[PDB]
Structures are given as structure tokens and as C-alpha cells.
Structure 1
Amino acid sequence: SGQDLVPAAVEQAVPIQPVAGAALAAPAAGQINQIDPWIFQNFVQCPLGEFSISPRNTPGEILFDLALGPGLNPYLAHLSAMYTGWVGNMEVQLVLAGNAFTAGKVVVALVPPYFPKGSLTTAQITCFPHVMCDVRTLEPIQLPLLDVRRVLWHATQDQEESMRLVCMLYTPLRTNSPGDESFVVSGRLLSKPAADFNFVYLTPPIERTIYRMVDLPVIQPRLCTHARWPAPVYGLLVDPSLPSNPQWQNGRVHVDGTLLGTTPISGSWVSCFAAEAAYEFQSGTGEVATFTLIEQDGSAYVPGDRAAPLGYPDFSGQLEIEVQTETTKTGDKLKVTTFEMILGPTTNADQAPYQGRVFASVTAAASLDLVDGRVRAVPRSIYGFQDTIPEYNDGLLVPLAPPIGPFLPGEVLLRFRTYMRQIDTADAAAEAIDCALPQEFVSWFASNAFTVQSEALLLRYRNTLTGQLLFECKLYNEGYIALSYSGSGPLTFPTDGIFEVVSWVPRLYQLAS
């Protein structure tokens, strides 16, 4: 236990008066509402209460920024489904217990209500009541988080202007360590309610709210399906020798439920389309079938913001599809035939699925006349696959999903891989098509409609049998998972684990490799 640290960094005086909590809102609420007196005894960790200061952070980087509320406690964020209203202050600790070789200071201010958010430069964060503290402090730095308000309480709906608590990185982090390591101090943030926190009015406990952090399905990735091709997942892996910021359109959801692009909710819709065909027997390339692209069930198609019908193949290649048709010959009614369409651009085509028309063909010399009508196309095999966003118009622009990124310097995209049926002539290896998130998470996020807190979700990946955490990763709020990997060779992981969330982290959270 070295005392070359700073143990004289106690809870300093802040220029603020004591603020009355539940004594004001007692005769304006309709009932008597006390909470359990063992909630006030121990400091438990905030849900957004995990941050990290790498030495690649400039001064003026906001480490955490969390409003006062019931979202600073796992107990009060659980009790606030039962109530509509809260008052009173909290008491927040800070575990900044970095190494004895680091050097640097943080400053934790007390931003009042109705202060405009956004910029908050480092010059003006000292003008608030603030506490300055080193990153080597042994004891936990305590600080009060008062409830400055003009109304008698706050509703438990997060649009309340309330007192924030911003932590700017004041001076940069550096180590006087004799070689090759630059330590990343990993702080935590503990909190408990003060002596006069109180909820206001009892209410039916609704789960679908705020806070009620994100949950994930307990299913292994070797069981889940793929969101760019109708197949299972066959092992996730990182690779820094690939297109690093792709621009896919299938299987890209937000973590507030809103699907982004041409992505469906059902898993039997990806790389599939349904249309009302128009067949014709040609003396050239066999048959020609135009299409009028609509949904699979029967919903109409008007070209709006999605670049294609939901579930359209968002890659490039020569796609062989299966459709059962009504042959007008005498002896057989139904037989599924195999067309082949120019799904890729291939430097020239005649198809533009943004306005609802693709054109398939099957090489057949006999006069094969088909009763035209509604059909549903499904893929069979791929020929000359490229992972490029195709031409949804003929050569024009379309409303696309934005490209995947940006990452931090040193963060690699996590890719769930599957293998498509291919038509290969000289090659004997499988074609690898990867997605940013499987379909079982898109149907989990669309069917729950979560509320994102800050910027990103800190995940883990734990093996089922050993119980060993394989890695930790950072699920951003755009539906991709970026983890920190240093090298460049393709690193592969086992697939029998299960993901599990931990906390909300900002974009500045440096991950361990």
C-alpha cells in the first residue's frame, strides 16, 4: 500500500447551498410514498457508470455526462416503473484508482438546468461548481448532485431539464513508466440516493419504458440465422484485411427499433422478393420474365425512402432464383423452374429495382409458355459474387443506408459469417458473406423498441461451459459491433457463447484487446 499517491483528495467544498428535496413536494402529491431504507445504505454502480481514459484523449473530451434522475441507480431505475415522479438529490462516488505512474487531472462540474447542451468547451467547465481531482486518488471521491428545479417534482419521462454532471478531461493522461506500456485508467461511478429522495405517485408497472436497459436473447450465434442470406451463422471472426467501412443495406437496425435500409423483420424475407411476373418465350435467351416488385404478402409498393423492397438482395452477382409457375401444357400444372437474373451491376444491366422492376431469364429452347401472375422468388445459388451495393436505379442515385462507421483508431468490425451456395468453376473454397448483426437481433430490436441512452453498448461474450469471458466489444447505436484488435491476421472465435450487455458507454471508451 504505497502512499506516493494522493490520499488528500477528499470530498472538497463546492459553492452550493443545501437544496430541499421531498419537503416541498409533500403537500402536492396525493399519497405517502417511502422507499426501502436499505437502498440508502450502499453505493451501487450506475448503469451508465463505466468510463475509461486512454492516453489518446485530448483535453476537453467529455468522459461521462449523466443527468440527475432515477437512471443513476439500478434500484431506482427499477422502482421508477411503478411511479410517476421523483424529487431529491443523489450522492455520487468516483473510483479513479489508477496506477502510481500515471499523471493527469479530471474536473467534475455541476451544470444547472436549462443550460444549452452541445459544445461545453473546457474553458467554461470551470465556471460551474466543480471538483478537481487527480487520477491516482486512493479513496473514492464523493460529491453531491443537487436537485435544482423550478417545479415541485419531475416526471419520470426523460425530457426533464435537470441538473447534469459533466466530467471533462482537464489535463491529458501520461505515464512516467520506464518502458513500453501506457496504462488506461478505468474508472467507475457509484451512487446512492441521498436522505430525502422520494417518489411521488404510484402507477401500474409498465416494462416498455426508458430505463429498462437493453436485454439480449440467450441464444448461441451457432443457432441464429443470417441477415444477408437465408442460412445459419458459421462462426464470427474479425479481419482487418477486408472492406473496413462497408455500405450494406440488409440486416442494419438501430437500437431504438427503427430499421435502416431494405431490411425486413422476418427471417424468411432476406434475399427474396415477390412480384407479378410477365413471361414470354424467346427465340434468343430462352425466356424473359419482367417483374412488378411488391411485398411478399400483398402490401403495395410506393418508392419512398427504402432503396428497394424489404428483403431485396443488397449484394452483387448473378443470382439464380426459384419460382413455381403454372405451365399451360397438358399433363403437368406446377413445376418450379430456375431463372437467372443480373442482380449485380456487372457494368451494364436493364434492371432498376428502385422503381419496382427486375428482369429474370431461363435458357430454354422449347416454347415454354407460362400463365403469368403472382410469384415469390427465392435464391438458389450465386455466380460471380461481389459485396457491392448494386444499382437500384439504372445509373442514378438512391436513398441508401449510411456506411458502417466510424470506429476509433485501432477498432475492427465484428463480422458474423455464413457461406452461400455458389457456382464455382476453378475454386473449391466457400464464398464468405458477412453481416454486421444477425437477424435474431434485428427481430429482437424491432419487437422491443428500446431507448438508447448515450452512444454505445458495452457487450461481453462468455462461453457456456467454461464460463470464460472471451472478449468485450462495443455495440454502437447504429447496429454494428466494433472491438479492439491490434494485428492484421484473421482472428476467429468460438461460436457456442452468448452475448450479454453490461453498460452504456460513450464513443471514447477504449477497449482491451
Structure 2
Amino acid sequence: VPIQPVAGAALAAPAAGQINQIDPWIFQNFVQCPLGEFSISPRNTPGEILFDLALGPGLNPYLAHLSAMYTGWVGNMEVQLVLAGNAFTAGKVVVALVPPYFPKGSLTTAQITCFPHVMCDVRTLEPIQLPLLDVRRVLWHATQDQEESMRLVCMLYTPLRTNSPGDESFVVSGRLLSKPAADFNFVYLTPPIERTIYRMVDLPVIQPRLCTHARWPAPVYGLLVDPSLPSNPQWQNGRVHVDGTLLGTTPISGSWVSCFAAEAAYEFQSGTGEVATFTLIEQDGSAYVPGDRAAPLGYPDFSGQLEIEVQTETTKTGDKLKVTTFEMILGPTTNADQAPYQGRVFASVTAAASLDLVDGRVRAVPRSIYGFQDTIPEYNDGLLVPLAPPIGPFLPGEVLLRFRTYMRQIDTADAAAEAIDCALPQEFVSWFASNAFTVQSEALLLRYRNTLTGQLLFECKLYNEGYIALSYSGSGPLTFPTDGIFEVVSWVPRLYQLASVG
């Protein structure tokens, strides 16, 4: 390739306090890059980027671990592209050396050859060994942020011309392997901050039968997919990102789920009963402001007639403090002018006279539901508010995993419980919030495996928007046992195809 040599530690060593050698056995092994893997299919149009990997310590896991106890790094790497095709195949890839400070996205096929590049046939026997050099403007790179280093881009240059038997299409699968060059080292030995460097995402070791549902204060009963249900719900509770961004009205605590905290003004109306006007606050004691979310944190994101329980203090003799059940319609179209986005809602109970209740602070918890509807409630009296987006999109053949619990239902005819679903339990929401991981791809590959048997029940994908997708082409609902553990394998791209279940 037409590129000069790059001085690594030689240019760093005067303005660096220490120049820190790594184990010579790490220079002796090619380790797989965590995302550098592709499969060329014959249906791939040329121009498709196969991978795009930046130079850094995150290419190697041993360098990614070592870099926590260092201030800086500098140097070059060696890289191997491995292609698993045979003879009888015919296609080309081009691996380019993109510099730093070059734009990203949308690079055509003529442009990839205007770089330093190699062009290699899928029939290549040996790996293609590549230099990934540290073309930099600084004297060394600081380990705890990621600036512009050289990328390594591979895109399909010439399509694949194979025979492909009828049962299964042929693919040329490529892997990318790497090790540091002889000129790679670290800079200044610091205390090993474990918190955030390149720490792989890990989930809590908790069974889903022990979890807590995130849209209703009840334990999780079911773990299942159902394509008959709407695969893009616009839910507002139990919405978290992976890197720790709470979406919508998602609370931290499981106690705040489907509850609200307010100041109640109690007034009697004849023919209706005791109507309480609730001025909403945040449930930790601070006030609520109409802002970037639909409601105060923990407000219910469903419709129907909810019975709430409020701690009522009365002025009547013979009683001081009690727990009173009110009724409150939620949505989607109500006549009581429910505006939780403004922080002012209304509830009522059928009372023959004035209950003589002291106007004051309450935290209403839900008691039961009448007429459950899996839709958004009325936040601004018919006017639509800023909402968290619907859950999706999916690759075709991938369905949304659902955590199911059952609600207390007022029902005069049927006894079948209202099964309400969320996308993630509250333990995973609080885990993602309290960890605040660094995200380096667009999907996490998860394995659900039973503990005592070791039986890998399914592999599944976790997206960064906070929802788990399975590869399931079946139409009926399939339940899964809630005794296993979700474990993280790796970062995988969003276009990654799974293995089907059922």
C-alpha cells in the first residue's frame, strides 16, 4: 500500500512521562475484533460496506483491558482479513485505509480505490495482512476518550458468482483479526478505573420470575413473543436506552410504576360524589413542569377506569386517617378533562355527601382497572404530546419479546386477567441507568440460558433503543420458561441475522 511508516512511541517518548511496554505474548496472537465479521452473499450489491473498524485499543480485548490502567496509548497495529470461500467463487473486496478527519457514511465503489487499499479475491488462501497505522496529529492518544484515528474500511468490490445449492445459499464469511505492531505501547500508569473505559455490557444475574414488571406494579409472570399483538407499541413506561438514557415517563424505582403523587383538593358535587382535583408533582417531593415527556415520572401509559388509593385525612369525628378508593378515567377520550401533561388531573368517587377530606399531599397507587386498553392515555385533553417513539424497527423475521404480568381487573362478566406487557423489566432499566455503559454498535447479542441445565434456550438481540428481538417466524404466541439468565455475548451490528426458534 502507498503509505509512509508512522512513528509511534518514538514521537511520543519526549512529552510522555512513562512509555509502558506490554506483555510480549500479546504481540504473538491474533485476536478477533469484536465487530469485524461479515458474510458476502450473492445477493449483495457491490458498494456495500462490509466493515468499518477504527484503530484503537478496543480492537484487541487485551489492549482494551490494559488501557484502563494507562493515561494514553500510541502506535500501529497488524490486521488479518480471513475469507472463508473456496475455488468456484469469483468476487473481490477492497480494504481501504481511511485517514482520520475524513467524513463518514456513503462511500461509492470508485471512491474506495482512491485510498491506500488492497483488492483481494474471495479465493485467497492465506489471510490478507494489513498495516493499520497511527496517522495522528497528536503525540499520543488519551485512552479515556476516542478521537479520530485511522479507520479500516472493507466493502464488496465485485459481486459473488457462485452456484448455491437449493437448501441453503452459499456465503463467503470473513473475519478480521488483529494484534499490536512492535511499535504500540501505552503512556502513563494510572489507577485502574474500572467504571467506564471499554467495559463490556453485562446484565444482572436475575431470573425473570424474580423481576418486576415496568408498566404495572406486579411481578413478571410471562416471557413470550406474540406477532398477533401490535409489533410497534408506543409505550412510555419501561423505556430505557442501553447507555442509560431514560425515555418517556420511565422512572428509576419500581415503586413509582403506574402511580402518581399530587396535591389533592377535595370538593363535593351532587350526583357525582366527591371529586378530587390533583395537582401533580414528582414523586420524590419535587414539582412537575411540562417538558420533554408526556407526564410525570411513573404516570400510567394506558387507558381505562383506574381505581386509585389515597391516604385521606378527614375532619369528621371518629376517624383521622384512612385509605380511600377513588375512580379516575384515563383515556383515550375522556370528558373529565384529564391533563397529566399540564400536571392537573381529576378523580371522583360516588359519595352521597361531602367526605370532608383535608386538602393535602397524597401518593395515589393503583387498585384495579376497568376496561383496559393497550394504547396511549389522554395527556393534554386530546392534544398529542412529546412521546417516546414506537418500539422498532425490526428486521423481517424478528419479533418483539414481551414481559407479561396480570392486572387486577374490575369485570362483571369475564375472569380472565388483563395481561399487560412491557419491553424490559424494571431491574434492567435501573441496571442500564445506574451503569451508563458505553455503546459501540447497534445491537447486543444476548443468550437466554437456563441456569442449572445449561440449555441454551434462545439467542436474541438487544437494541440500543431498549427492546429485545427474537428470530421467530411463527404466528402464534410462544411462551418461554422464566428460570434462565440473559447473558451478553458481544456487540453485533443491526443487520446481523439470528438463528430461528420455535
TM more than 0.5:
yes
Judge conservation of contact 1:101–1:177 (CA < 8 Å) in 2.
Answer: no
Judge conservation of contact 1:51–1:505 (CA < 8 Å) in 2.
Answer: no
More strand by share: 2
Cα deviation code 1:183-216 (max 9, x no counterpart): 4555433221111111011112112223112121
**Alpha-carbon deviation of 1:56?**
6.0
Rounded Cα–Cα distance in structure 2 between residues aligned with 1:159 and 1:278: 54
SS at match of 2:128: coil
Judge conservation of contact 2:209–2:220 (CA < 8 Å) in 1.
Answer: yes
| Higher mean C-alpha deviation, range 16-25 or range 315-324 | 16-25
Judge conservation of contact 2:283–2:297 (CA < 8 Å) in 1.
Answer: no
Judge conservation of contact 2:100–2:136 (CA < 8 Å) in 1.
Answer: yes
SS at match of 1:441: helix
Rounded Cα–Cα distance in structure 2 between residues aligned with 1:304 and 1:349: 23
Rounded Cα–Cα distance in structure 1 between residues aligned with 2:456 and 2:353: 61
In structure 2, list runs of 5 or more residues that go unmatched.
none
Relative to the length of structure 2, the TM-score reads 0.94
SS at match of 1:211: coil
1:362-511 to structure 2, matched below 5 A, reads 362-511=349-498
Cα deviation code 1:150-187 (max 9, x no counterpart): 32211114341110011223345575233132245554
Judge conservation of contact 1:317–1:343 (CA < 8 Å) in 2.
Answer: yes
Q: Structure 1 pair 279/186, CA: closer, same or farther in 2 (3 Å)? A: farther
Rounded Cα–Cα distance in structure 1 between residues aligned with 2:203 and 2:112: 37
Number of residue pairs matched by the alignment: 500
Rounded Cα–Cα distance in structure 1 between residues aligned with 2:480 and 2:77: 42
Rounded Cα–Cα distance in structure 2 between residues aligned with 1:103 and 1:339: 73
| Higher mean C-alpha deviation, range 235-244 or range 50-59 | 50-59
Rounded Cα–Cα distance in structure 2 between residues aligned with 1:101 and 1:380: 68
Q: Structure 1 pair 433/95, CA: closer, same or farther in 2 (3 Å)? A: farther
Percent of aligned pairs with the same amino acid: 100
Cα deviation code 1:355-414 (max 9, x no counterpart): 001111111224322111000000111111111111210121211111111112222111
Cα deviation code 1:328-353 (max 9, x no counterpart): 22112122111111112246441111
| Higher mean C-alpha deviation, range 153-162 or range 296-305 | 153-162
Q: Structure 1 pair 383/183, CA: closer, same or farther in 2 (3 Å)? A: farther
| Higher mean C-alpha deviation, range 110-119 or range 266-275 | 110-119
**Alpha-carbon deviation of 1:418?**
1.4
In structure 1, list runs of 5 or more residues that go unmatched.
1-13
Judge conservation of contact 2:341–2:380 (CA < 8 Å) in 1.
Answer: yes
SS at match of 1:23: helix
Rounded Cα–Cα distance in structure 2 between residues aligned with 1:101 and 1:326: 84
Relative to the length of structure 1, the TM-score reads 0.92
Q: Structure 1 pair 134/266, CA: closer, same or farther in 2 (3 Å)? A: farther
Judge conservation of contact 1:317–1:386 (CA < 8 Å) in 2.
Answer: yes
Rounded Cα–Cα distance in structure 1 between residues aligned with 2:90 and 2:480: 36
Judge conservation of contact 1:50–1:503 (CA < 8 Å) in 2.
Answer: no
Judge conservation of contact 1:235–1:492 (CA < 8 Å) in 2.
Answer: yes
Rounded Cα–Cα distance in structure 2 between residues aligned with 1:74 and 1:362: 62
Q: Structure 1 pair 270/293, CA: closer, same or farther in 2 (3 Å)? A: same
Cα deviation code 1:129-154 (max 9, x no counterpart): 22334456554433221111232211
2:179 alignment partner in structure 1: 192
Judge conservation of contact 1:53–1:510 (CA < 8 Å) in 2.
Answer: no
Q: Structure 1 pair 272/58, CA: closer, same or farther in 2 (3 Å)? A: farther
Rounded Cα–Cα distance in structure 2 between residues aligned with 1:275 and 1:55: 61
Rounded Cα–Cα distance in structure 1 between residues aligned with 2:173 and 2:489: 15
**Alpha-carbon deviation of 1:319?**
0.8
Are 1:270 and 2:290 counterparts? no
Q: Structure 1 pair 329/103, CA: closer, same or farther in 2 (3 Å)? A: farther
What value does the CA root-mean-square deviation take over the aligned residues?
2.1
| Higher mean C-alpha deviation, range 279-288 or range 345-354 | 345-354
SS at match of 2:64: helix
SS at match of 1:508: coil
Q: Structure 1 pair 99/158, CA: closer, same or farther in 2 (3 Å)? A: farther
Cα deviation code 1:283-316 (max 9, x no counterpart): 2122101100001221111111121000000111
| Higher mean C-alpha deviation, range 318-327 or range 173-182 | 173-182
**Alpha-carbon deviation of 1:458?**
1.5
Residue from 159, 162, 167 that aligns with 2:154: 167
Rounded Cα–Cα distance in structure 1 between residues aligned with 2:331 and 2:90: 55
Cα deviation code 1:198-252 (max 9, x no counterpart): 1011112112223112121111111111111111112311121111111111111
Q: Structure 1 pair 443/53, CA: closer, same or farther in 2 (3 Å)? A: farther
Are 1:257 and 2:249 counterparts? no
Judge conservation of contact 1:257–1:449 (CA < 8 Å) in 2.
Answer: yes
Q: Structure 1 pair 22/478, CA: closer, same or farther in 2 (3 Å)? A: same
**Alpha-carbon deviation of 1:104?**
4.5
Rounded Cα–Cα distance in structure 2 between residues aligned with 1:340 and 1:102: 70
Judge conservation of contact 1:420–1:431 (CA < 8 Å) in 2.
Answer: yes
Q: Structure 1 pair 188/218, CA: closer, same or farther in 2 (3 Å)? A: farther
